[PDB]
Design a protein around this ligand. Structure first.
Ligand code: CL
Ligand code: NA
Ligand code: NA
Ligand code: NA
Lengths: 206, 186
């Protein structure tokens, strides 16, 4: 017997500046929606468009493939929540793909102990970028940070690796096991989630 | 030495975008968070009228000489508004200090970037017809109007446009560095 309450587009994110996805939530305190429709227009155009893909982003999401995504151009979007008693519209949300970039975590974090003759020994960390980022053309630029700590230590040691995909750490405590994680951000944008940890035992003879 | 030039250029451009981002955020949170200034920002940039690539594929389609010259037009077009932004802000008695310092730094760094760009073009494309055709900014009366709301909104749009354009210049310089130096195997 109630129309939907007022829905909210609460987040958008682009993982690679080539596609993006936005997510909404239904308002509490109205009735159950039976449909949502996300519409938008773009700065400098009058054409109104519907969300091009309601499936890929899962529940209550709009995903914009490559053919609907461009940088440097505001999207003005709105979602409505409808049922047989009526309808409710979100606030318009102003989004620029340029400012919502957050990559997925780096992949294949691997770690090794290296003990060279009379050069300082070291921990060798290596990893790869998330898939579907285009670094090779210079479209996308990725910066990385490593953190590592033994269990029960109160602080992580953080090392900024800039754009390298490998790094060397000196003077770890001999005999201690370390948890190592890597994360990445665009040149301009948000840090990814930390990768899952890799574990490494630093040998006694270090 | 192309590689040292590109490297310095990309340092300046990525730094200019940083400063512009921070200036806009400090202006926004302090002067305009209290209304639909965002709604007024729509379609209002003086470089709008230029033919700029909007996605990776368009950037790859551009020939390189026209792409470099494009970056140079965009940067030459910002000479004027950055001058006025600094002049106007500096001449207030209660000038927001954090904002003023970034604007002065951007104004100076933008000159240094443009010099680099001019070196890069004469190294990579020595023949280029020297001929300026960049778009004109003519927004000074609005920055000067006594009506505070119209004034703050003209500042909002200028800063919003600068944050956009610096980001775009940085990104296009990064595409070009990778194209010209590394045949797109950065
Ligand atoms: Cl972040
Ligand atoms: Na996406
Ligand atoms: Na959906
Ligand atoms: Na696209």
């Amino acid at each position: 017997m109630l129309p939907p309450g007022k829905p909210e587009i609460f987040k958008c994110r682009s993982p690679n500046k080539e596609t993006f996805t936005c997510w909404w939530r239904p308002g509490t305190d109205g009735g159950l929606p039976t449909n949502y429709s996300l519409t938008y227009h773009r700065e400098g155009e009058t054409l109104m468009h519907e969300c091009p893909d309601y499936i890929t982003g899962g529940p209550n999401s709009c995903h914009f493939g490559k053919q609907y995504t461009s940088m440097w151009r505001t999207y003005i979007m709105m979602v409505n929540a409808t049922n047989q008693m009526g309808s409710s519209f979100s606030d318009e949300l102003y989004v620029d793909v340029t400012y919502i970039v957050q990559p997925d975590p780096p992949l294949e974090l691997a770690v090794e102990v290296k003990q060279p003759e009379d050069r300082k020994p070291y921990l060798w960390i290596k990893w790869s970028p998330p898939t579907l980022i285009d670094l090779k053309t210079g479209w996308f630029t990725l910066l990385y940070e490593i953190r590592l700590k033994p269990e029960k230590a109160a602080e992580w040691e953080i090392h900024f690796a800039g754009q390298q995909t490998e790094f060397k750490i000196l003077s770890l405590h001999p005999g201690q096991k370390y948890l190592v994680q890597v994360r990445c951000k665009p040149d301009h944008g948000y840090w990814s989630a930390w990768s899952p940890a890799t574990f490494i035992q630093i040998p006694s003879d270090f | 030495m192309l590689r040292d030039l590109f490297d310095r250029a990309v340092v300046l451009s990525a730094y200019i975008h940083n400063l512009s981002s921070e200036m806009f955020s400090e202006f926004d949170k302090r002067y305009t968070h209290g209304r639909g200034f965002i709604t007024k920002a729509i379609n209002s940039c003086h470089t709008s009228s230029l033919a700029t690539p909007e996605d990776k594929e368009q950037a790859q389609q551009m020939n390189q000489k026209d792409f470099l010259s494009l970056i140079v037009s965009i940067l030459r077009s910002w000479n004027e508004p950055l001058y006025h932004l600094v002049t106007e802000v500096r001449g207030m008695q209660e000038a927001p200090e954090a904002i003023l310092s970034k604007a002065v730094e951007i104004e100076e760094q933008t000159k240094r970037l443009l010099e680099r760009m001019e070196l890069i073009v004469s190294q990579v494309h020595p023949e280029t017809k020297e001929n300026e055709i960049y778009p004109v900014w003519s927004g000074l009366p609005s920055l000067q109007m006594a009506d505070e709301e119209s004034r703050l909104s003209a500042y909002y749009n200028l800063l919003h446009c600068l944050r956009r354009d610096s980001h775009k210049i940085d990104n296009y310089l990064k595409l070009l560095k990778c194209r010209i130096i590394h045949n797109n195997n950065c």
